[PDB]
Design an enzyme around this catalytic site. Structure first.
Site, PDB file in Angstrom:
ATOM      1  N   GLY A  16      -8.767  12.644   1.734  1.00  0.00           N
ATOM      2  CA  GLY A  16      -9.384  13.747   2.453  1.00  0.00           C
ATOM      3  C   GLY A  16     -10.868  13.548   2.487  1.00  0.00           C
ATOM      4  N   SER A  17     -11.580  14.593   2.902  1.00  0.00           N
ATOM      5  CA  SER A  17     -13.042  14.539   2.967  1.00  0.00           C
ATOM      6  C   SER A  17     -13.587  14.311   1.558  1.00  0.00           C
ATOM      7  CB  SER A  17     -13.618  15.822   3.586  1.00  0.00           C
ATOM      8  OG  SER A  17     -12.853  16.951   3.191  1.00  0.00           O
ATOM      9  N   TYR A  18     -12.935  14.944   0.576  1.00  0.00           N
ATOM     10  CA  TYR A  18     -13.249  14.767  -0.851  1.00  0.00           C
ATOM     11  C   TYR A  18     -13.298  13.316  -1.339  1.00  0.00           C
ATOM     12  CZ  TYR A  18      -8.145  14.404  -1.405  1.00  0.00           C
ATOM     13  OH  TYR A  18      -6.827  14.047  -1.300  1.00  0.00           O
ATOM     14  N   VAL A  21      -6.885  10.090  -3.726  1.00  0.00           N
ATOM     15  CA  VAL A  21      -6.150  10.372  -4.988  1.00  0.00           C
ATOM     16  C   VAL A  21      -5.238   9.214  -5.253  1.00  0.00           C
ATOM     17  CG1 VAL A  21      -4.681  11.968  -6.286  1.00  0.00           C
ATOM     18  CG2 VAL A  21      -6.191  12.826  -4.507  1.00  0.00           C
ATOM     19  N   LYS A  36      -8.071  11.919  -8.821  1.00  0.00           N
ATOM     20  CA  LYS A  36      -8.849  12.168  -7.629  1.00  0.00           C
ATOM     21  C   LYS A  36     -10.164  11.407  -7.802  1.00  0.00           C
ATOM     22  CE  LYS A  36      -9.427  16.514  -5.486  1.00  0.00           C
ATOM     23  NZ  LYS A  36      -9.746  17.922  -5.953  1.00  0.00           N
ATOM     24  N   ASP A 136      -7.466  29.228  -0.914  1.00  0.00           N
ATOM     25  CA  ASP A 136      -6.808  28.213  -0.076  1.00  0.00           C
ATOM     26  C   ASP A 136      -5.322  28.057  -0.395  1.00  0.00           C
ATOM     27  OD1 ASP A 136      -6.786  26.454   2.086  1.00  0.00           O
ATOM     28  OD2 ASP A 136      -7.632  24.771   0.938  1.00  0.00           O
TER      29      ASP A 136
HETATM   30  C1  LIG Z   1      -4.855  15.304  -7.672  1.00  0.00           C
HETATM   31  C2  LIG Z   1      -4.946  16.418  -6.655  1.00  0.00           C
HETATM   32  C3  LIG Z   1      -3.689  17.300  -6.546  1.00  0.00           C
HETATM   33  C4  LIG Z   1      -3.487  17.965  -7.892  1.00  0.00           C
HETATM   34  O1  LIG Z   1      -4.214  18.891  -8.233  1.00  0.00           O
HETATM   35  N1  LIG Z   1      -2.496  17.489  -8.700  1.00  0.00           N
HETATM   36  C5  LIG Z   1      -2.385  18.045 -10.059  1.00  0.00           C
HETATM   37  C6  LIG Z   1      -1.502  16.584  -8.238  1.00  0.00           C
HETATM   38  C7  LIG Z   1      -0.460  16.146  -9.071  1.00  0.00           C
HETATM   39  N2  LIG Z   1       0.489  15.325  -8.628  1.00  0.00           N
HETATM   40  C8  LIG Z   1       0.433  14.962  -7.334  1.00  0.00           C
HETATM   41  N3  LIG Z   1       1.448  14.173  -6.915  1.00  0.00           N
HETATM   42  C9  LIG Z   1       1.745  13.610  -5.653  1.00  0.00           C
HETATM   43  C10 LIG Z   1       1.109  13.956  -4.459  1.00  0.00           C
HETATM   44  C11 LIG Z   1       1.455  13.312  -3.294  1.00  0.00           C
HETATM   45  C12 LIG Z   1       2.432  12.324  -3.305  1.00  0.00           C
HETATM   46  C13 LIG Z   1       2.794  11.568  -2.068  1.00  0.00           C
HETATM   47  O2  LIG Z   1       3.927  11.112  -1.925  1.00  0.00           O
HETATM   48  N4  LIG Z   1       1.789  11.326  -1.203  1.00  0.00           N
HETATM   49  C14 LIG Z   1       1.974  10.678   0.097  1.00  0.00           C
HETATM   50  C15 LIG Z   1       1.651   9.195  -0.005  1.00  0.00           C
HETATM   51  C16 LIG Z   1       1.641   8.535   1.374  1.00  0.00           C
HETATM   52  N5  LIG Z   1       0.726   9.222   2.297  1.00  0.00           N
HETATM   53  C17 LIG Z   1       0.683   8.537   3.620  1.00  0.00           C
HETATM   54  C18 LIG Z   1       1.120  10.625   2.462  1.00  0.00           C
HETATM   55  C19 LIG Z   1       1.092  11.363   1.132  1.00  0.00           C
HETATM   56  C20 LIG Z   1       3.046  11.961  -4.501  1.00  0.00           C
HETATM   57  C21 LIG Z   1       2.720  12.605  -5.676  1.00  0.00           C
HETATM   58  O3  LIG Z   1       3.270  12.341  -6.899  1.00  0.00           O
HETATM   59  C22 LIG Z   1       4.193  11.264  -7.038  1.00  0.00           C
HETATM   60  N6  LIG Z   1      -0.521  15.345  -6.464  1.00  0.00           N
HETATM   61  C23 LIG Z   1      -1.501  16.152  -6.902  1.00  0.00           C
HETATM   62  N7  LIG Z   1      -2.529  16.541  -6.027  1.00  0.00           N
HETATM   63  C24 LIG Z   1      -2.631  16.215  -4.565  1.00  0.00           C
HETATM   64  C25 LIG Z   1      -1.500  16.749  -3.694  1.00  0.00           C
HETATM   65  C26 LIG Z   1      -1.602  15.935  -2.416  1.00  0.00           C
HETATM   66  C27 LIG Z   1      -2.464  14.716  -2.734  1.00  0.00           C
HETATM   67  C28 LIG Z   1      -2.622  14.718  -4.238  1.00  0.00           C
END
Ligand SMILES: CC[C@@H]1C(=O)N(C)c2cnc(Nc3ccc(C(=O)NC4CCN(C)CC4)cc3OC)nc2N1C1CCCC1
Length: 271
Positions: A16-18, A21, A36, A136
């Site tokens: 993202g803009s941030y 991850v 992140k 949000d």
């Molecule tokens: C760290 C920021 C925030 C947070 O606060 N925590 C705690 C967090 C804990 N765990 C996750 N986990 C996963 C999040 C997304 C995915 C996933 O499959 N992402 C795709 C990958 C391919 N891409 C083209 C499209 C997206 C897998 C995850 O775990 C296996 N995300 C977290 N997020 C965010 C939530 C969306 C981004 C990250």
């Protein structure tokens, strides 16, 4: 992969803009985390002049450090060397990622929506108790954990207050989820807790229909619909108690909008 202190950084799970991850494997405890990664130089790059972008990130961190609840995300480490461009925020992984992307052709069932909505109530009640207005709430910020329950993520525009509620003037959040009282052209003051209730209501509508109640690719027109358009439900067909609850959360007047203690007592929630 790459190494960062005790972590092995692997697949990219967000951007993202941030910044981005990464999935991060902690070699000391054999456990996966979400890292992140933010660039300070990239961050540098109701319309009040907010504090600077790095400073907003530190506010987010300060809020995250206060929060320990099963329906809220858990920040575990911050790595911020003064001589490096990058800032790293390490969270406990939430296995199954965001509950949904909107729009989707695959909405949740009413029972699955109730289950997640109950988690959302419990998380929001906790945040409000901790004097945090999230600002949000939306499906993509609700992450499904290994135990199948949701956790509220992304405190990037959240506000911390003292007293019974926040007194807010800044128009922040995701446009489709912003409450009408936050969208006046006139500079005005609005309370925070009701903003989150409105966003919960939009979220619940999204859960069961896969699309928001107010939609427009033109953001200016979207804001107008939120302020002026009556809530409508499609023909495809939900229970009347659910329609009542959504209707009460999407009351355009924050003075009469349903409050969280009442949401907990609503028939749809307790059945
Ligand atoms: C760290 C920021 C925030 C947070 O606060 N925590 C705690 C967090 C804990 N765990 C996750 N986990 C996963 C999040 C997304 C995915 C996933 O499959 N992402 C795709 C990958 C391919 N891409 C083209 C499209 C997206 C897998 C995850 O775990 C296996 N995300 C977290 N997020 C965010 C939530 C969306 C981004 C990250």
């Amino acid at each position: 992969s790459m190494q960062l202190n005790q972590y092995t950084l692997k697949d990219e799970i967000g951007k993202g803009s941030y910044g981005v991850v990464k999935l991060a494997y902690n070699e000391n405890d054999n456990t996966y985390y979400a890292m992140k990664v933010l660039s300070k130089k990239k961050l540098i790059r109701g319309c009040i002049q907010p504090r600077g972008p790095i400073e907003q990130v530190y506010q987010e961190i300060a809020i995250l450090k206060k929060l320990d609840h099963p329906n809220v995300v858990k920040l575990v480490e911050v790595l911020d060397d003064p001589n490096e461009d990058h800032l790293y925020m390490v969270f406990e992984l939430v296995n199954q990622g965001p509950v949904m992307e909107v729009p989707t052709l695959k909405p949740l069932s009413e029972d699955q929506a109730r289950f997640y909505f109950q988690d959302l109530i419990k998380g929001i009640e906790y945040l409000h108790y901790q004097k945090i207005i999230h600002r949000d709430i939306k499906p993509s910020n609700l992450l499904v954990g290994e135990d199948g329950h949701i956790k509220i993520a992304d405190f990037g525009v959240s506000n911390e207050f003292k007293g019974s509620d926040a007194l807010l003037s800044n128009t922040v959040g995701t446009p489709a989820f912003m409450a009408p009282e936050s969208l006046s052209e006139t500079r005005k003051i609005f309370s925070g807790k009701a903003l989150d209730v409105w966003a919960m209501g939009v979220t619940l509508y999204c859960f069961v229909f896969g699309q928001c109640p107010f939609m427009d690719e033109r953001i200016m027109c979207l804001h107008s619909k939120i302020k002026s358009q009556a809530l409508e439900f499609p023909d495809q067909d939900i229970a009347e108690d659910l329609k009542d609850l959504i209707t009460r959360m999407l009351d355009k007047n924050p003075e009469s909008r349903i409050v969280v203690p009442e949401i907990k007592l609503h028939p749809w929630v307790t059945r």
